[PDB]
Amino acid sequence: GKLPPGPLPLPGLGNLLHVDFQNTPYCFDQLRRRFGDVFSLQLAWTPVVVLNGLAAVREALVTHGEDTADRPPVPITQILGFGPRSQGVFLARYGPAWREQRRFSVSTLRNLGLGKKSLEQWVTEEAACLCAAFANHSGRPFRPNGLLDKAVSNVIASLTCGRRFEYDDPRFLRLLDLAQEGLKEESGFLREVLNAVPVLLHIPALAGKVLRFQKAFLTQLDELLTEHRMTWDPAQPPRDLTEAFLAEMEKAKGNPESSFNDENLRIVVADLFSAGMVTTSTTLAWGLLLMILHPDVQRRVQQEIDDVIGQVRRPEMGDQAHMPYTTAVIHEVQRFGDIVPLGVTHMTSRDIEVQGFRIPKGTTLITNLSSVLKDEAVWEKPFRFHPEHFLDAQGHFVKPEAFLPFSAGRRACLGEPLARMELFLFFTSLLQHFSFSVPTGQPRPSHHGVFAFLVSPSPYELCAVPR
Ligand code: HEM
Ligand SMILES: CSc1ccc2c(c1)N(CC[C@H]1CCCCN1C)c1ccccc1S2
Ligand SMILES: CSc1ccc2c(c1)N(CC[C@H]1CCCCN1C)c1ccccc1S2
Ligand SMILES: [Zn+2]
Ligand SMILES: [Zn+2]
Ligand SMILES: [Zn+2]
């Protein structure tokens, strides 16, 4: 068939000069309007095809799901100890090493969500610690980003290591700092050359520079995992994900085919921290910003909280089914926030057809999730913060098919259930105890995000006064 249309590639630079990596989302919307829902791009050495709109995204990730579940190879991961049997989950090539870990994480999260419901208890407890930290600001204006990062990070810590860290723990803070620096190493021209020409990794200066923060991150992680290994009681059922992994590691001793080994454990835990911290934290940061920019919505949320939960009792997941408006608001925060505009890249493992065009095997697929969440043909006013995008005239919560912030198909966010829990419990707990507002004498913060691959709220401060 015909290959997707797009800007004519430059002789050597290809379409690199046709893409603004500072505002890639805006740039891609421009290309979409010009070339259609499915367009091509030759970014450096990689042939790329961008998918816009729900139809294109689903046809690729769902209809042709078996052929689009792979990730583009990333040579530099060798630096982090990657191997055929240890690829973590996030960037693991489609195959058994990924599927065994995918199934393990999914079932493990599900299990920690049943019975005594450990996950919900850890989250509820963290929300209380978070509220107390907000109160310590005594009404003084502050940037809530740091605390949101710590609260969300502690939830992953609870899930993986069965513990939390005090907000002033040296090790915890170093870990968070390394995490934010590490995210940056996902961009840059250096990584682009090294991945295209892996032999350049033989030069110490370069190999030791591309992922210095991510390597240090893993090193800090090793220290924590080693301590956990000492406290693990194998005679009791696994209390957290690392214990379940260790138990599986023991059963796999002697099996060279297993993905349960020391090299993979550190990668899997690092992946959960990496994929689950900045996302959930940035979403909550958008949440509070939108609440001070739209006080009316905030009051309506607080009125539903008071009517369903009261001002004493801690919010519970059971309350969610009875708070359609708060659910609508949280969903609109994600839709409007659009924190992962271009999702995570996929790679075709077989020629496929999308919207009639031919997609050669080995093509890197970019899912423009932003084009789905902001589609003008689906949403009433995609560019406004409008809770009613998820409510009907009767006030019932309705979730359009276009709500795909976690993507779709076999590789769709495995943390979605936990993210939903964290967003509801952290948001409601905070709105239940505080009234948030923009600090006087300060300009109304912008609703425009700052793109750095991940889309964050423009820097802002706020006052949290007890209710
Ligand atoms: C508001 C929160 C979150 C958002 C918007 C988000 C979004 C996403 C997106 C867009 C992807 C890529 C899907 C694809 O490849 O097509 C992804 C993957 C993934 N997410 Fe999340 N995420 C969130 C939180 C979480 C959390 C809390 C965890 C961890 C417990 C996590 C775990 C992962 C993992 C491990 C993957 C890779 C799955 C695979 O390759 O099979 N995420 N997420
Ligand atoms: C703490 S550095 C950090 C922070 C946030 C993110 C990521 C890394 N990762 C990759 C996870 C990586 C962690 C080290 C072990 C190997 N695995 C692959 C990422 C990659 C591409 C899009 C989004 C993201 S979210
Ligand atoms: C892995 S998740 C992911 C998802 C979408 C984009 C990116 C990464 N990348 C660069 C990695 C890749 C993109 C295709 C061309 C070959 N290179 C290696 C990026 C970085 C900064 C601004 C925009 C983008 S688009
Ligand atoms: Zn434990
Ligand atoms: Zn209805
Ligand atoms: Zn209170």
Side-chain angles (χ1 to χ4, degrees):
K2 304 290 296 299
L3 300 170
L8 179 59
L10 188 157
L13 296 68
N15 307 78
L16 291 176
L17 302 185
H18 304 359
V19 181
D20 178 58
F21 294 98
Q22 336 312 308
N23 301 68
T24 302
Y26 279 127
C27 169
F28 277 17
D29 283 3
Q30 175 65 296
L31 295 180
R32 184 191 61 259
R33 284 193 282 284
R34 190 181 306 170
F35 304 92
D37 288 343
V38 182
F39 65 79
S40 304
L41 287 177
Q42 178 57 273
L43 309 180
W45 300 276
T46 323
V48 178
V49 168
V50 185
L51 304 170
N52 302 268
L54 183 65
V57 176
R58 293 191 68 274
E59 185 177 6
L61 301 186
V62 180
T63 306
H64 298 293
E66 307 178 307
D67 301 341
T68 58
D70 204 3
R71 298 290 189 209
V74 178
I76 65 175
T77 54
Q78 306 170 13
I79 295 179
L80 307 184
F82 272 58
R85 248 55 239 214
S86 63
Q87 308 183 49
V89 172
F90 204 80
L91 296 182
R93 295 302 299 283
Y94 183 61
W98 162 83
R99 182 157 32 245
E100 182 169 47
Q101 285 308 309
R102 171 78 187 201
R103 179 181 62 169
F104 169 80
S105 272
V106 167
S107 66
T108 298
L109 282 168
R110 183 194 307 125
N111 297 330
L112 297 183
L114 302 172
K116 57 187 298 295
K117 287 174 162 55
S118 296
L119 286 176
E120 179 168 358
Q121 193 179 308
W122 289 315
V123 174
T124 297
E125 291 177 1
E126 200 59 31
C129 296
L130 179 60
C131 285
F134 266 48
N136 289 327
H137 276 281
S138 303
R140 283 270 76 205
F142 66 105
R143 291 191 180 182
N145 307 63
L147 285 170
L148 292 177
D149 286 344
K150 295 175 186 178
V152 174
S153 292
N154 268 332
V155 167
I156 298 183
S158 300
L159 155 71
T160 60
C161 311
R163 70 162 294 176
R164 74 178 294 273
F165 297 85
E166 295 294 345
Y167 293 162
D168 75 317
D169 178 285
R171 227 147 41 156
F172 187 42
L173 302 183
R174 173 89 181 312
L175 190 67
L176 304 199
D177 190 48
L178 295 177
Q180 64 162 55
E181 293 294 351
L183 171 57
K184 300 178 178 178
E185 305 184 313
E186 289 302 322
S187 298
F189 186 53
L190 212 203
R191 67 149 40 235
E192 288 295 12
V193 185
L194 298 180
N195 277 308
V197 185
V199 297
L200 291 175
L201 286 172
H202 285 91
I203 302 178
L206 301 179
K209 184 194 298 180
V210 247
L211 303 173
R212 48 170 174 149
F213 285 108
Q214 285 195 23
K215 279 190 64 175
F217 180 72
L218 281 165
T219 294
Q220 253 294 191
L221 214 64
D222 290 327
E223 191 190 312
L224 302 178
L225 286 165
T226 293
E227 295 190 359
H228 188 189
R229 177 117 47 167
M230 172 57 69
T231 62
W232 171 41
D233 184 354
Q236 289 302 308
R239 217 177 62 82
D240 46 57
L241 188 153
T242 294
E243 286 178 21
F245 192 104
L246 292 176
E248 285 306 320
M249 201 180 300
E250 270 292 301
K251 289 163 56 190
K253 284 182 71 171
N255 183 4
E257 289 181 35
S258 187
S259 70
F260 292 98
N261 49 67
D262 290 336
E263 297 82 359
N264 210 23
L265 173 65
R266 64 202 295 275
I267 301 178
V268 167
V269 174
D271 278 0
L272 296 175
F273 264 107
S274 302
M277 136 68 125
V278 68
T279 50
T280 313
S281 191
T282 300
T283 298
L284 286 167
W286 268 106
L288 304 184
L289 168 63
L290 292 161
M291 289 306 95
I292 65 175
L293 243 43
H294 302 270
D296 44 327
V297 173
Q298 177 176 173
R299 310 196 203 82
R300 285 197 59 182
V301 164
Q302 290 164 326
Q303 188 54 60
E304 197 185 38
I305 291 176
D306 298 324
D307 295 355
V308 174
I309 305 173
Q311 271 185 292
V312 170
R313 170 168 142 294
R314 289 175 176 182
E316 289 167 38
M317 281 312 299
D319 300 334
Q320 186 276 304
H322 302 84
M323 297 166 83
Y325 190 77
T326 293
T327 301
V329 175
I330 293 177
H331 279 66
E332 177 70 350
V333 167
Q334 288 194 273
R335 191 206 63 84
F336 188 86
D338 187 21
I339 65 161
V340 192
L342 307 173
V344 177
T345 55
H346 289 243
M347 176 173 78
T348 59
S349 56
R350 282 181 180 169
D351 275 51
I352 61 173
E353 184 165 299
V354 175
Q355 303 293 293
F357 301 87
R358 189 177 74 80
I359 306 294
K361 162 181 174 182
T363 304
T364 285
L365 255 34
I366 297 189
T367 58
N368 193 328
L369 298 182
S370 185
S371 71
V372 184
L373 297 171
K374 302 288 181 60
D375 192 348
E376 282 169 294
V378 173
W379 311 92
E380 195 188 322
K381 46 189 65 171
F383 309 124
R384 321 296 272 295
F385 175 64
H386 187 65
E388 292 61 37
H389 278 128
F390 300 84
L391 297 168
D392 57 33
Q394 195 77 315
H396 301 147
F397 168 77
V398 299
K399 182 173 65 176
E401 301 298 299
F403 182 74
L404 281 190
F406 303 100
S407 192
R410 296 164 161 62
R411 289 283 193 142
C413 185
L414 59 75
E416 183 174 346
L418 178 54
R420 284 254 68 78
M421 171 175 288
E422 292 188 75
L423 293 186
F424 179 85
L425 295 178
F426 279 133
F427 191 67
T428 64
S429 296
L430 288 170
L431 280 268
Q432 168 190 51
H433 295 303
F434 303 96
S435 185
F436 300 90
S437 62
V438 304
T440 62
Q442 287 180 44
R444 146 165 292 221
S446 175
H447 47 296
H448 293 300
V450 45
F451 177 81
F453 175 42
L454 251 273
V455 180
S456 298
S458 189
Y460 70 90
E461 280 182 40
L462 82 197
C463 292
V465 304
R467 300 180 62 227

